[PDB]
């Protein structure tokens, strides 16, 4: 697992460090398949993101939907940039909440406002919305 000490190091360049670490811990504690990763966003600059899967029930079954939540250095004042990350055995379902690049669009992200908006609330919304319209489907 990851420690708060290691997280603080990862967000050293962030404007609101304690707040970002606090929510990250909350998220990875509840969602065991999400992992904090420090990587180059779009190959432009380094940012920490939460990568992995979240459990989403659809038509009676639960799926481990692969996602990636990029936390900007302005987190939590600005919402995260989120993507669905299909494996080779699946395809991105472009639609109301997902564009051609797998980027996620949600009213929750659009009107994001700290402190009423947070990652736990966002993920809860994803589970509900994706449970209605999956962002990815498996190849036949």
């Amino acid at each position: 697992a990851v420690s708060e000490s290691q997280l603080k190091k990862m967000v050293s360049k962030y404007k609101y460090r304690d707040l970002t670490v606090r929510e990250t811990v909350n998220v990875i504690t509840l969602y065991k398949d999400l992992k904090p990763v420090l990587d180059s966003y779009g190959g432009s600059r380094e940012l920490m993101n939460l990568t992995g899967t979240i459990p989403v029930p659809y038509r009676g079954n639960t799926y481990n939907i692969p996602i990636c939540l990029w936390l900007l250095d302005t987190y939590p004042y600005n919402p995260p940039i989120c993507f669905v990350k299909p494996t080779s055995s699946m395809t991105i379902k472009t639609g109301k909440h997902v564009d051609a690049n797998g980027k996620i669009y949600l009213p929750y992200l659009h009107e994001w406002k700290h402190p009423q908006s947070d990652l736990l609330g966002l993920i809860q919304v994803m589970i509900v919305v994706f449970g209605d319209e999956p962002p990815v489907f498996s190849r036949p």
Partner: peptide, 9 residues
């Protein structure tokens, strides 16, 4: 956990 997705409909 391994990434999974519902079958194409």
């Amino acid at each position: 956990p391994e990434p999974t997705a519902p079958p194409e409909e």
